[PDB]
PDB file of all heavy atoms in Angstrom:
ATOM      1  N   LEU A 225     -25.202  33.432   9.093  1.00 95.13           N
ATOM      2  CA  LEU A 225     -26.252  32.325   9.001  1.00 95.13           C
ATOM      3  C   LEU A 225     -27.659  32.977   8.695  1.00 95.13           C
ATOM      4  O   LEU A 225     -28.679  32.740   9.334  1.00 95.13           O
ATOM      5  CB  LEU A 225     -26.357  31.692  10.336  1.00 95.13           C
ATOM      6  N   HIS A 229     -32.270  28.218   1.476  1.00 96.70           N
ATOM      7  CA  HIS A 229     -31.643  27.137   0.683  1.00 96.70           C
ATOM      8  C   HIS A 229     -31.763  26.931  -0.913  1.00 96.70           C
ATOM      9  O   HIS A 229     -31.631  25.897  -1.390  1.00 96.70           O
ATOM     10  CB  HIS A 229     -31.939  25.838   1.387  1.00 96.70           C
ATOM     11  N   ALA A 231     -24.005  24.208  -2.263  1.00100.85           N
ATOM     12  CA  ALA A 231     -23.300  23.395  -1.244  1.00100.85           C
ATOM     13  C   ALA A 231     -21.840  23.916  -1.004  1.00100.85           C
ATOM     14  O   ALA A 231     -20.888  23.644  -1.809  1.00100.85           O
ATOM     15  CB  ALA A 231     -23.263  21.979  -1.679  1.00100.85           C
ATOM     16  N   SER A 281     -18.847  -4.097  11.197  1.00106.34           N
ATOM     17  CA  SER A 281     -18.335  -2.996  10.382  1.00106.34           C
ATOM     18  C   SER A 281     -18.546  -1.626  11.097  1.00106.34           C
ATOM     19  O   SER A 281     -17.610  -0.772  11.000  1.00106.34           O
ATOM     20  CB  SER A 281     -18.905  -2.997   9.037  1.00106.34           C
ATOM     21  OG  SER A 281     -20.314  -2.650   9.041  1.00106.34           O
ATOM     22  N   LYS A 282     -19.642  -1.404  11.818  1.00108.48           N
ATOM     23  CA  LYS A 282     -19.935  -0.210  12.477  1.00108.48           C
ATOM     24  C   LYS A 282     -20.656  -0.627  13.826  1.00108.48           C
ATOM     25  O   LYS A 282     -21.615  -1.329  13.773  1.00108.48           O
ATOM     26  CB  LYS A 282     -20.824   0.720  11.639  1.00108.48           C
ATOM     27  CG  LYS A 282     -21.662   0.034  10.549  1.00108.48           C
ATOM     28  CD  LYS A 282     -23.081   0.037  10.947  1.00108.48           C
ATOM     29  CE  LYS A 282     -23.917  -0.240   9.739  1.00108.48           C
ATOM     30  NZ  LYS A 282     -23.705  -1.445   9.032  1.00108.48           N
ATOM     31  N   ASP A 285     -23.974  -2.532  14.364  1.00106.67           N
ATOM     32  CA  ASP A 285     -24.007  -3.908  14.027  1.00106.67           C
ATOM     33  C   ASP A 285     -23.930  -4.803  15.357  1.00106.67           C
ATOM     34  O   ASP A 285     -24.105  -6.125  15.245  1.00106.67           O
ATOM     35  CB  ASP A 285     -23.019  -4.409  13.093  1.00106.67           C
ATOM     36  CG  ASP A 285     -23.138  -3.822  11.770  1.00106.67           C
ATOM     37  OD1 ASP A 285     -23.713  -2.699  11.615  1.00106.67           O
ATOM     38  OD2 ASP A 285     -22.789  -4.541  10.770  1.00106.67           O
ATOM     39  N   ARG A 397     -35.093   4.326  12.699  1.00 88.78           N
ATOM     40  CA  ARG A 397     -34.039   3.324  13.104  1.00 88.78           C
ATOM     41  C   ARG A 397     -32.748   4.024  13.540  1.00 88.78           C
ATOM     42  O   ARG A 397     -32.521   3.848  14.754  1.00 88.78           O
ATOM     43  CB  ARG A 397     -33.750   2.511  11.855  1.00 88.78           C
ATOM     44  CG  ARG A 397     -34.067   0.971  12.056  1.00 88.78           C
ATOM     45  CD  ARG A 397     -32.672   0.197  11.830  1.00 88.78           C
ATOM     46  NE  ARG A 397     -32.071   0.478  10.518  1.00 88.78           N
ATOM     47  CZ  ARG A 397     -30.805   0.190  10.266  1.00 88.78           C
ATOM     48  NH1 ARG A 397     -29.940  -0.269  11.232  1.00 88.78           N
ATOM     49  NH2 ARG A 397     -30.299   0.476   9.032  1.00 88.78           N
ATOM     50  N   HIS A 398     -32.023   4.787  12.728  1.00 88.93           N
ATOM     51  CA  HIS A 398     -30.847   5.420  13.051  1.00 88.93           C
ATOM     52  C   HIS A 398     -30.834   6.186  14.392  1.00 88.93           C
ATOM     53  O   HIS A 398     -29.973   6.016  15.229  1.00 88.93           O
ATOM     54  CB  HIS A 398     -30.303   6.335  12.022  1.00 88.93           C
ATOM     55  CG  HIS A 398     -30.127   5.628  10.659  1.00 88.93           C
ATOM     56  ND1 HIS A 398     -30.996   5.947   9.595  1.00 88.93           N
ATOM     57  CD2 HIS A 398     -29.294   4.795  10.175  1.00 88.93           C
ATOM     58  CE1 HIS A 398     -30.708   5.194   8.576  1.00 88.93           C
ATOM     59  NE2 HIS A 398     -29.585   4.500   8.876  1.00 88.93           N
ATOM     60  N   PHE A 599     -22.744   4.414  13.354  1.00 89.17           N
ATOM     61  CA  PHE A 599     -23.052   4.530  11.914  1.00 89.17           C
ATOM     62  C   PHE A 599     -21.876   5.226  11.214  1.00 89.17           C
ATOM     63  O   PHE A 599     -21.966   5.394   9.944  1.00 89.17           O
ATOM     64  CB  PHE A 599     -24.312   5.241  11.702  1.00 89.17           C
ATOM     65  CG  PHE A 599     -25.510   4.441  12.205  1.00 89.17           C
ATOM     66  CD1 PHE A 599     -26.272   4.819  13.298  1.00 89.17           C
ATOM     67  CD2 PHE A 599     -25.941   3.259  11.561  1.00 89.17           C
ATOM     68  CE1 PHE A 599     -27.340   4.102  13.875  1.00 89.17           C
ATOM     69  CE2 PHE A 599     -26.998   2.513  12.107  1.00 89.17           C
ATOM     70  CZ  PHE A 599     -27.688   2.998  13.190  1.00 89.17           C
TER      71      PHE A 599
ATOM     72  P     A C   1     -14.853  23.595  22.085  1.00 87.50           P
ATOM     73  OP1   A C   1     -13.473  24.132  21.791  1.00 87.50           O
ATOM     74  OP2   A C   1     -14.934  23.229  23.724  1.00 87.50           O
ATOM     75  O5'   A C   1     -15.900  24.818  21.875  1.00 87.50           O
ATOM     76  C5'   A C   1     -17.288  24.598  22.240  1.00 87.50           C
ATOM     77  C4'   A C   1     -18.071  25.847  21.935  1.00 87.50           C
ATOM     78  O4'   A C   1     -16.999  26.871  21.467  1.00 87.50           O
ATOM     79  C3'   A C   1     -19.046  25.799  20.723  1.00 87.50           C
ATOM     80  O3'   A C   1     -20.202  25.073  21.122  1.00 87.50           O
ATOM     81  C2'   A C   1     -19.081  27.230  20.215  1.00 87.50           C
ATOM     82  O2'   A C   1     -19.870  28.106  20.952  1.00 87.50           O
ATOM     83  C1'   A C   1     -17.588  27.662  20.383  1.00 87.50           C
ATOM     84  N9    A C   1     -16.777  27.510  19.220  1.00 87.50           N
ATOM     85  C8    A C   1     -15.763  26.588  19.065  1.00 87.50           C
ATOM     86  N7    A C   1     -15.165  26.628  17.890  1.00 87.50           N
ATOM     87  C5    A C   1     -15.910  27.624  17.201  1.00 87.50           C
ATOM     88  C6    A C   1     -15.728  28.181  15.957  1.00 87.50           C
ATOM     89  N6    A C   1     -14.788  27.750  15.012  1.00 87.50           N
ATOM     90  N1    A C   1     -16.577  29.147  15.558  1.00 87.50           N
ATOM     91  C2    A C   1     -17.479  29.569  16.421  1.00 87.50           C
ATOM     92  N3    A C   1     -17.773  29.111  17.723  1.00 87.50           N
ATOM     93  C4    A C   1     -16.863  28.073  18.007  1.00 87.50           C
ATOM     94  P     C C   2     -21.524  25.889  21.508  1.00 88.57           P
ATOM     95  OP1   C C   2     -21.181  26.901  22.534  1.00 88.57           O
ATOM     96  OP2   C C   2     -22.537  24.812  21.821  1.00 88.57           O
ATOM     97  O5'   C C   2     -22.009  26.565  20.252  1.00 88.57           O
ATOM     98  C5'   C C   2     -22.770  27.796  20.262  1.00 88.57           C
ATOM     99  C4'   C C   2     -23.035  28.413  18.977  1.00 88.57           C
ATOM    100  O4'   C C   2     -21.684  28.761  18.360  1.00 88.57           O
ATOM    101  C3'   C C   2     -23.784  27.589  17.990  1.00 88.57           C
ATOM    102  O3'   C C   2     -25.204  27.630  18.140  1.00 88.57           O
ATOM    103  C2'   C C   2     -23.288  28.255  16.657  1.00 88.57           C
ATOM    104  O2'   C C   2     -23.957  29.433  16.447  1.00 88.57           O
ATOM    105  C1'   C C   2     -21.873  28.566  16.915  1.00 88.57           C
ATOM    106  N1    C C   2     -20.857  27.624  16.426  1.00 88.57           N
ATOM    107  C2    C C   2     -20.553  27.701  15.066  1.00 88.57           C
ATOM    108  O2    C C   2     -21.112  28.479  14.367  1.00 88.57           O
ATOM    109  N3    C C   2     -19.629  26.758  14.579  1.00 88.57           N
ATOM    110  C4    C C   2     -19.083  25.900  15.339  1.00 88.57           C
ATOM    111  N4    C C   2     -18.172  25.070  14.770  1.00 88.57           N
ATOM    112  C5    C C   2     -19.370  25.826  16.703  1.00 88.57           C
ATOM    113  C6    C C   2     -20.316  26.608  17.242  1.00 88.57           C
ATOM    114  P     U C   3     -26.069  26.434  17.472  1.00 90.33           P
ATOM    115  OP1   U C   3     -27.409  26.447  18.137  1.00 90.33           O
ATOM    116  OP2   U C   3     -25.195  25.191  17.384  1.00 90.33           O
ATOM    117  O5'   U C   3     -26.302  26.910  16.002  1.00 90.33           O
ATOM    118  C5'   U C   3     -26.561  28.243  15.674  1.00 90.33           C
ATOM    119  C4'   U C   3     -26.266  28.630  14.224  1.00 90.33           C
ATOM    120  O4'   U C   3     -24.743  28.624  13.980  1.00 90.33           O
ATOM    121  C3'   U C   3     -26.710  27.480  13.294  1.00 90.33           C
ATOM    122  O3'   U C   3     -28.109  27.691  12.959  1.00 90.33           O
ATOM    123  C2'   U C   3     -25.865  27.778  12.099  1.00 90.33           C
ATOM    124  O2'   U C   3     -26.296  28.789  11.277  1.00 90.33           O
ATOM    125  C1'   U C   3     -24.505  28.055  12.725  1.00 90.33           C
ATOM    126  N1    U C   3     -23.585  26.867  12.872  1.00 90.33           N
ATOM    127  C2    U C   3     -22.776  26.647  11.858  1.00 90.33           C
ATOM    128  O2    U C   3     -22.720  27.254  10.797  1.00 90.33           O
ATOM    129  N3    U C   3     -21.862  25.466  12.073  1.00 90.33           N
ATOM    130  C4    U C   3     -21.873  24.787  13.146  1.00 90.33           C
ATOM    131  O4    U C   3     -21.026  23.883  13.211  1.00 90.33           O
ATOM    132  C5    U C   3     -22.712  25.090  14.175  1.00 90.33           C
ATOM    133  C6    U C   3     -23.619  26.171  14.012  1.00 90.33           C
ATOM    134  P     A C   4     -28.874  26.721  12.044  1.00 87.67           P
ATOM    135  OP1   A C   4     -30.351  26.759  12.320  1.00 87.67           O
ATOM    136  OP2   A C   4     -28.094  25.405  11.995  1.00 87.67           O
ATOM    137  O5'   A C   4     -28.709  27.311  10.590  1.00 87.67           O
ATOM    138  C5'   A C   4     -28.992  26.603   9.493  1.00 87.67           C
ATOM    139  C4'   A C   4     -27.942  26.570   8.386  1.00 87.67           C
ATOM    140  O4'   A C   4     -26.719  26.607   8.944  1.00 87.67           O
ATOM    141  C3'   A C   4     -27.948  25.329   7.628  1.00 87.67           C
ATOM    142  O3'   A C   4     -29.038  25.262   6.643  1.00 87.67           O
ATOM    143  C2'   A C   4     -26.572  25.280   6.998  1.00 87.67           C
ATOM    144  O2'   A C   4     -26.474  26.087   5.805  1.00 87.67           O
ATOM    145  C1'   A C   4     -25.733  25.902   8.078  1.00 87.67           C
ATOM    146  N9    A C   4     -24.973  24.974   8.891  1.00 87.67           N
ATOM    147  C8    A C   4     -25.106  24.707  10.281  1.00 87.67           C
ATOM    148  N7    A C   4     -24.351  23.738  10.601  1.00 87.67           N
ATOM    149  C5    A C   4     -23.625  23.400   9.506  1.00 87.67           C
ATOM    150  C6    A C   4     -22.557  22.503   9.344  1.00 87.67           C
ATOM    151  N6    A C   4     -22.002  21.717  10.295  1.00 87.67           N
ATOM    152  N1    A C   4     -21.984  22.312   8.065  1.00 87.67           N
ATOM    153  C2    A C   4     -22.558  23.102   7.105  1.00 87.67           C
ATOM    154  N3    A C   4     -23.497  23.982   7.141  1.00 87.67           N
ATOM    155  C4    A C   4     -24.014  24.085   8.439  1.00 87.67           C
ATOM    156  P     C C   5     -29.332  24.025   5.899  1.00 89.07           P
ATOM    157  OP1   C C   5     -30.497  24.176   5.019  1.00 89.07           O
ATOM    158  OP2   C C   5     -29.320  22.867   6.867  1.00 89.07           O
ATOM    159  O5'   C C   5     -28.048  23.848   4.962  1.00 89.07           O
ATOM    160  C5'   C C   5     -28.211  23.506   3.594  1.00 89.07           C
ATOM    161  C4'   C C   5     -26.938  22.806   3.178  1.00 89.07           C
ATOM    162  O4'   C C   5     -25.844  23.020   4.198  1.00 89.07           O
ATOM    163  C3'   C C   5     -27.047  21.226   3.238  1.00 89.07           C
ATOM    164  O3'   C C   5     -27.702  20.768   2.147  1.00 89.07           O
ATOM    165  C2'   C C   5     -25.642  20.743   3.329  1.00 89.07           C
ATOM    166  O2'   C C   5     -24.905  20.818   2.130  1.00 89.07           O
ATOM    167  C1'   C C   5     -25.064  21.822   4.333  1.00 89.07           C
ATOM    168  N1    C C   5     -25.139  21.423   5.690  1.00 89.07           N
ATOM    169  C2    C C   5     -24.222  20.431   6.081  1.00 89.07           C
ATOM    170  O2    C C   5     -23.444  19.975   5.269  1.00 89.07           O
ATOM    171  N3    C C   5     -24.262  20.091   7.398  1.00 89.07           N
ATOM    172  C4    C C   5     -25.191  20.424   8.253  1.00 89.07           C
ATOM    173  N4    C C   5     -25.157  20.086   9.546  1.00 89.07           N
ATOM    174  C5    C C   5     -26.134  21.488   7.860  1.00 89.07           C
ATOM    175  C6    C C   5     -26.076  21.881   6.540  1.00 89.07           C
ATOM    176  P     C C   6     -29.212  20.138   2.261  1.00 86.44           P
ATOM    177  OP1   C C   6     -30.143  20.770   1.390  1.00 86.44           O
ATOM    178  OP2   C C   6     -29.481  20.125   3.672  1.00 86.44           O
ATOM    179  O5'   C C   6     -28.946  18.647   1.745  1.00 86.44           O
ATOM    180  C5'   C C   6     -28.615  17.629   2.592  1.00 86.44           C
ATOM    181  C4'   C C   6     -27.162  17.198   2.406  1.00 86.44           C
ATOM    182  O4'   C C   6     -26.313  17.967   3.178  1.00 86.44           O
ATOM    183  C3'   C C   6     -26.903  15.751   2.707  1.00 86.44           C
ATOM    184  O3'   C C   6     -27.281  14.952   1.542  1.00 86.44           O
ATOM    185  C2'   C C   6     -25.392  15.813   3.036  1.00 86.44           C
ATOM    186  O2'   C C   6     -24.692  15.798   1.937  1.00 86.44           O
ATOM    187  C1'   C C   6     -25.248  17.158   3.745  1.00 86.44           C
ATOM    188  N1    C C   6     -25.634  17.164   5.214  1.00 86.44           N
ATOM    189  C2    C C   6     -24.872  16.259   6.029  1.00 86.44           C
ATOM    190  O2    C C   6     -24.019  15.554   5.594  1.00 86.44           O
ATOM    191  N3    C C   6     -25.310  16.164   7.360  1.00 86.44           N
ATOM    192  C4    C C   6     -26.306  16.969   7.840  1.00 86.44           C
ATOM    193  N4    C C   6     -26.632  16.831   9.094  1.00 86.44           N
ATOM    194  C5    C C   6     -26.989  17.855   6.926  1.00 86.44           C
ATOM    195  C6    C C   6     -26.568  17.905   5.621  1.00 86.44           C
ATOM    196  P     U C   7     -28.467  13.945   1.652  1.00 86.20           P
ATOM    197  OP1   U C   7     -29.005  13.783   0.291  1.00 86.20           O
ATOM    198  OP2   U C   7     -29.382  14.347   2.835  1.00 86.20           O
ATOM    199  O5'   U C   7     -27.772  12.619   2.171  1.00 86.20           O
ATOM    200  C5'   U C   7     -26.442  12.350   1.488  1.00 86.20           C
ATOM    201  C4'   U C   7     -25.600  11.743   2.723  1.00 86.20           C
ATOM    202  O4'   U C   7     -25.357  12.731   3.672  1.00 86.20           O
ATOM    203  C3'   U C   7     -26.296  10.600   3.408  1.00 86.20           C
ATOM    204  O3'   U C   7     -26.179   9.469   2.681  1.00 86.20           O
ATOM    205  C2'   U C   7     -25.498  10.614   4.787  1.00 86.20           C
ATOM    206  O2'   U C   7     -24.262   9.923   4.640  1.00 86.20           O
ATOM    207  C1'   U C   7     -25.233  12.103   4.982  1.00 86.20           C
ATOM    208  N1    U C   7     -26.163  12.702   6.003  1.00 86.20           N
ATOM    209  C2    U C   7     -25.942  12.426   7.257  1.00 86.20           C
ATOM    210  O2    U C   7     -25.009  11.848   7.715  1.00 86.20           O
ATOM    211  N3    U C   7     -26.844  13.090   8.194  1.00 86.20           N
ATOM    212  C4    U C   7     -27.953  13.905   7.838  1.00 86.20           C
ATOM    213  O4    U C   7     -28.638  14.366   8.663  1.00 86.20           O
ATOM    214  C5    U C   7     -28.151  14.038   6.409  1.00 86.20           C
ATOM    215  C6    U C   7     -27.276  13.460   5.555  1.00 86.20           C
ATOM    216  P     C C   8     -27.354   8.362   2.766  1.00 84.23           P
ATOM    217  OP1   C C   8     -27.342   7.489   1.541  1.00 84.23           O
ATOM    218  OP2   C C   8     -28.646   9.085   3.022  1.00 84.23           O
ATOM    219  O5'   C C   8     -27.018   7.459   4.051  1.00 84.23           O
ATOM    220  C5'   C C   8     -25.794   6.819   4.112  1.00 84.23           C
ATOM    221  C4'   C C   8     -25.473   6.388   5.524  1.00 84.23           C
ATOM    222  O4'   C C   8     -25.418   7.644   6.387  1.00 84.23           O
ATOM    223  C3'   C C   8     -26.528   5.546   6.298  1.00 84.23           C
ATOM    224  O3'   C C   8     -26.284   4.132   6.058  1.00 84.23           O
ATOM    225  C2'   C C   8     -26.215   5.941   7.812  1.00 84.23           C
ATOM    226  O2'   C C   8     -25.152   5.161   8.279  1.00 84.23           O
ATOM    227  C1'   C C   8     -25.922   7.369   7.653  1.00 84.23           C
ATOM    228  N1    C C   8     -27.061   8.249   7.844  1.00 84.23           N
ATOM    229  C2    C C   8     -27.469   8.620   9.231  1.00 84.23           C
ATOM    230  O2    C C   8     -26.694   8.195  10.168  1.00 84.23           O
ATOM    231  N3    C C   8     -28.354   9.523   9.468  1.00 84.23           N
ATOM    232  C4    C C   8     -29.082  10.007   8.466  1.00 84.23           C
ATOM    233  N4    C C   8     -30.030  10.922   8.759  1.00 84.23           N
ATOM    234  C5    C C   8     -28.788   9.659   7.080  1.00 84.23           C
ATOM    235  C6    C C   8     -27.756   8.772   6.861  1.00 84.23           C
ATOM    236  P     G C   9     -26.986   3.026   6.885  1.00 87.39           P
ATOM    237  OP1   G C   9     -28.325   3.515   7.336  1.00 87.39           O
ATOM    238  OP2   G C   9     -26.062   2.490   7.911  1.00 87.39           O
ATOM    239  O5'   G C   9     -27.276   1.905   5.872  1.00 87.39           O
ATOM    240  C5'   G C   9     -28.493   1.862   5.017  1.00 87.39           C
ATOM    241  C4'   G C   9     -29.008   0.577   4.746  1.00 87.39           C
ATOM    242  O4'   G C   9     -27.951  -0.262   4.082  1.00 87.39           O
ATOM    243  C3'   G C   9     -29.306  -0.327   5.977  1.00 87.39           C
ATOM    244  O3'   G C   9     -30.653   0.059   6.584  1.00 87.39           O
ATOM    245  C2'   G C   9     -29.239  -1.714   5.447  1.00 87.39           C
ATOM    246  O2'   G C   9     -30.358  -2.073   4.688  1.00 87.39           O
ATOM    247  C1'   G C   9     -28.011  -1.559   4.533  1.00 87.39           C
ATOM    248  N9    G C   9     -26.743  -1.808   5.282  1.00 87.39           N
ATOM    249  C8    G C   9     -25.666  -0.924   5.338  1.00 87.39           C
ATOM    250  N7    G C   9     -24.720  -1.411   5.974  1.00 87.39           N
ATOM    251  C5    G C   9     -25.151  -2.714   6.308  1.00 87.39           C
ATOM    252  C6    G C   9     -24.385  -3.764   6.990  1.00 87.39           C
ATOM    253  O6    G C   9     -23.220  -3.735   7.470  1.00 87.39           O
ATOM    254  N1    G C   9     -25.129  -4.938   7.183  1.00 87.39           N
ATOM    255  C2    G C   9     -26.470  -5.153   6.604  1.00 87.39           C
ATOM    256  N2    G C   9     -26.981  -6.261   6.787  1.00 87.39           N
ATOM    257  N3    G C   9     -27.117  -4.123   5.939  1.00 87.39           N
ATOM    258  C4    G C   9     -26.314  -3.006   5.849  1.00 87.39           C
TER     259        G C   9
END
Side-chain angles (χ1 to χ4, degrees), chain A residues 231 281-282 285 397-398 599:
Chain A
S281 67
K282 25 107 162 60
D285 295 35
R397 239 242 303 161
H398 306 106
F599 291 110

